[PDB]
Design a protein around this ligand. Sequence first.
Ligand SMILES: *[C@@H]1O[C@H](CO)[C@@H](O[C@@H]2O[C@H](CO)[C@@H](O)[C@H](O)[C@H]2NC(C)=O)[C@H](O)[C@H]1NC(C)=O
Ligand SMILES: *[C@@H]1O[C@H](CO)[C@@H](O)[C@H](O)[C@H]1NC(C)=O
Ligand SMILES: *[C@@H]1O[C@H](CO)[C@@H](O)[C@H](O)[C@H]1NC(C)=O
Ligand SMILES: *[C@@H]1O[C@H](CO)[C@@H](O)[C@H](O)[C@H]1NC(C)=O
Ligand SMILES: [Cu+2]
Ligand SMILES: [Cu+2]
Ligand SMILES: [Cu+2]
Ligand SMILES: [Cu+2]
Lengths: 338, 338
Amino acid sequence: GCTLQNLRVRRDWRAFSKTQKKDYINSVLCLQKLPSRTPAHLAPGARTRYDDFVATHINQTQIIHYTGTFLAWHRYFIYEFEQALRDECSYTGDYPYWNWGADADNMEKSQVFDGSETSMSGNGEYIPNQGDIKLLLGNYPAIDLPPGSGGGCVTSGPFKDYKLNLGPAALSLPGGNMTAAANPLTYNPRCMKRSLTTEILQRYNTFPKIVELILDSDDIWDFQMTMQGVPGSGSIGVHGGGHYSMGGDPGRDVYVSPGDTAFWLHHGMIDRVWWIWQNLDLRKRQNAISGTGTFMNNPASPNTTLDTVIDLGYANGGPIAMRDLMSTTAGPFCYVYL
Amino acid sequence: GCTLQNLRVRRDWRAFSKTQKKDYINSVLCLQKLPSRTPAHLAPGARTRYDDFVATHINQTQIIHYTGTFLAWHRYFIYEFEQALRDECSYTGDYPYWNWGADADNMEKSQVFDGSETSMSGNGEYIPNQGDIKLLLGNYPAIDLPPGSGGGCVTSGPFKDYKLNLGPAALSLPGGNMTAAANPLTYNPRCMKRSLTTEILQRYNTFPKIVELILDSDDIWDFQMTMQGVPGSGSIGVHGGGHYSMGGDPGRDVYVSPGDTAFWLHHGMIDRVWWIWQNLDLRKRQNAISGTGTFMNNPASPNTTLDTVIDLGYANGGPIAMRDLMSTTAGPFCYVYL
Ligand SMILES: *[C@@H]1O[C@H](CO)[C@@H](O[C@@H]2O[C@H](CO)[C@@H](O)[C@H](O)[C@H]2NC(C)=O)[C@H](O)[C@H]1NC(C)=O
Ligand SMILES: *[C@@H]1O[C@H](CO)[C@@H](O)[C@H](O)[C@H]1NC(C)=O
Ligand SMILES: *[C@@H]1O[C@H](CO)[C@@H](O)[C@H](O)[C@H]1NC(C)=O
Ligand SMILES: *[C@@H]1O[C@H](CO)[C@@H](O)[C@H](O)[C@H]1NC(C)=O
Ligand SMILES: [Cu+2]
Ligand SMILES: [Cu+2]
Ligand SMILES: [Cu+2]
Ligand SMILES: [Cu+2]
């Protein structure tokens, strides 16, 4: 199946040429023009194929974060997105990732976020005198985060005229309040907001943090909890840092986060870090799983196993077992990271 | 509104005469014959009006246990179930509650579970050598519970030929495995299983335990947590105690628990205990609320407030705000407990 001949390579965004960057960006725009597949009565707010991906994430958020299926489900998700870009948008380039480490002293100068024509758009319109973001996970003390250097709609770049249609589902706001639609799958068109927060990166996504994550995680449990943020440490891990550092809407919504176009580059890096960690010890780590099928095991559910079946709903793909997802060179996958 | 004239009393099941016990039983059996309202595409496995109540519980479980609405939602839920009994089944008697304390040395002799024609059916067919029930609440060490003196389908009484149609959703088994239907709102007819476990009552629902709950809980948070089971404490509360002591299916499934006909008596007591606790200090406790709109706040959601609206779907009644649910003698309610 996976052979040296049909091996694809996943590459840092900093390693894409100007022409390669736009090829990718244009593909994603093409996803935002194509009509949605999700049946209107299940997600009335859906319009585009991109919406289809956003909807499944909202629909499944409760069963795909702090579960045994978190890493694998996301690996599939971004895989089937890539497959959309290829099969429907005629993309023939490589899957990009966002190397957090390289932008942690100055996020506004990040090639992902410089706001130029080769970025995923940039900062939001500056809003002064904003309160702090307070994240409560469960019932531990809230983590305190700076509001960032934007806050309003994105000012420049290829996604300035991009309409976000679904959400908000649980959007953290400056000051600590939280916006939640009666149901986030209905039509609520608005612009993508961002408030770039370099400080957040300084705390959680520096190169020391990333290496620590890889080298000090003895078991999948330790790995995936350190990545997501062990509730009660005041860490939100690399995965939280990457999300909240984008600020804005839906940067700060756990459910609607794919609504931000940097999601895919963010999760490319998640997948890369995971893949790396796995490969330090394939015999024990290749197929390791820990956790249940529910967020923090609340309500309790069965332990996830290789036999556990997961899907992307109407976004793309079909039902697929976990044993088919454990390797980037097995099942439906045949790629590495450079 | 509610006056001394139209006031209703809720009574201990032990205080029902043989005829009054039968009158209630026949009303519940009548709900198990009347056709459901839930539109079939939403719950394919619902057949009866009783099922409607089960289905809504399954649907909303994620947002009614360990939330700010837990107590108020259940008080409404059981009121609306009493209303179905009056309006559709001609019941004119009182709401019954199950006093856990009075049966905590020997549950098999309980007037609720004695297997007679005046009980909610009794124990299940005996199944020897069953392993221990292991409840994993969130990510804390497992709570061991004995397997009880039953296991099979109920052997006697009004509900021996009662068909349970929905679920399982997250059914804990002896040995520590858990059965979960791919989706539990589909048609899965089967008998009600029980495995009456006195020992669980001995640990969690004694008169000392119930009095501790009321007198030692200084605020609504302390109260609702102690009642449900504070996570990590190795306690499951009176709330968990009541359910798990029934054993069987769906006694051991947090989603489907209304499928067990004792659920309503159990929750009369829960409401009684809450009412009692409110009435020790009405200035502070009448409208006291704490917690969010998600199970253990996972994922994070807004704080429940008096303006938070809840519904029981197609079971009965309409949307209603929390402020209207706080008093047994205001809003739609006019009752007390003896
Ligand atoms: C949200 O997820 C639910 C499942 O949790 C999806 O509904 C299921 O879809 C399949 C269709 O193949 C049915 O056969 C199941 O019986 C459905 N289950 C339930 C509980 O409805 C639904 O597709 C998702 N909604 C969206 C918009 O993706
Ligand atoms: C929610 O209530 C708690 C007190 O229980 C408090 O810490 C916090 O201010 C409230 N949260 C919001 C978002 O208002
Ligand atoms: C379920 O798996 C968890 C780890 O995810 C483990 O602690 C527990 O012992 C397992 N139990 C069973 C019965 O599978
Ligand atoms: C379940 O809850 C959803 C979310 O509000 C609702 O729209 C749907 O009607 C409910 N289904 C049933 C069977 O009550
Ligand atoms: Cu996700
Ligand atoms: Cu993410
Ligand atoms: Cu309940
Ligand atoms: Cu209950």
